Amino acid sequence: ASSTTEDLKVSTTAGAAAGTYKINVTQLAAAQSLATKTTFATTKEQLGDTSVTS
Amino acid sequence: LTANSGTDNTMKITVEGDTKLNDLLAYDSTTNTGNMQELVKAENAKLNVNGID
C-alpha cells in the first residue's frame, strides 16, 4: 500500500484487496489528563496522612 | 464489492438459486436501483494534450 500524504501512514497485513481508497479524517483521538489543583513544594513532601500505614 | 476503473465496468449483479442472498446481493446499474447502496461512482479520465482532448 502507498499513500499520497505524509499525515497518513498505511501498512498492509495479509489478505487485503487491491484498489484505491479515499480517506477523509475528521477528528483525532485524545486522552483524558487529570491534574491536581493544589501545587506542592517538593516531590518528597508527604501528601497523605502519616497516621495510616496502608 | 469494488470493480475496476471506468464507466464500462459498472456492475449488474444477480443471485440465482437463492432468495435471501438475492435480497442481499442484487443491483442494476442501468436503472440505478437494487438492494445495495453505491458508495463511489464510476468515472473516466479526461485530459488535454497539446490542445487535443
Structure description:
Chain B: This is Flagellar hook-associated protein 2. Chain B: Homopentamer. Chain B: It is found in: Secreted; Bacterial flagellum. Chain B: Belongs to the FliD family. The PDB classes it as structural protein. The structure is cut from a larger assembly and holds 2 copies of chain A. With 54 residues, the first copy, chain A, is largely without helices or strands. Chain A is 0% helix and 0% strand. Chain A contains no helices and no strands. The first copy, chain A, is elongated and about 65 Å long. The N and C termini of chain A lie far apart (54 Å). The chains hardly touch.
Radius of gyration of chain A: 24 Å
Q: Given the structure, what is the number of helices of chain A?
A: 0
Structural class of chain A: little secondary structure
What is the percentage of strand-forming residues of chain A? under 5%
Q: Give the terminus-to-terminus CA distance of chain A.
A: 54 Å
Helicity range of the residues of chain A? under 10%
**What composes the largest sheet of chain A?**
none
Give the strand tally of chain A. Answer: 0
Q: Based on the structure, what is the oligomeric state of the protein chains? A: part of a larger assembly
Shape of chain A: elongated
PDB class: structural protein
Keywords: Complex, structural protein
Entry title: structure of FliD-FliC at a 10:10 stoichiometry
Chains A, B: Flagellar hook-associated protein 2
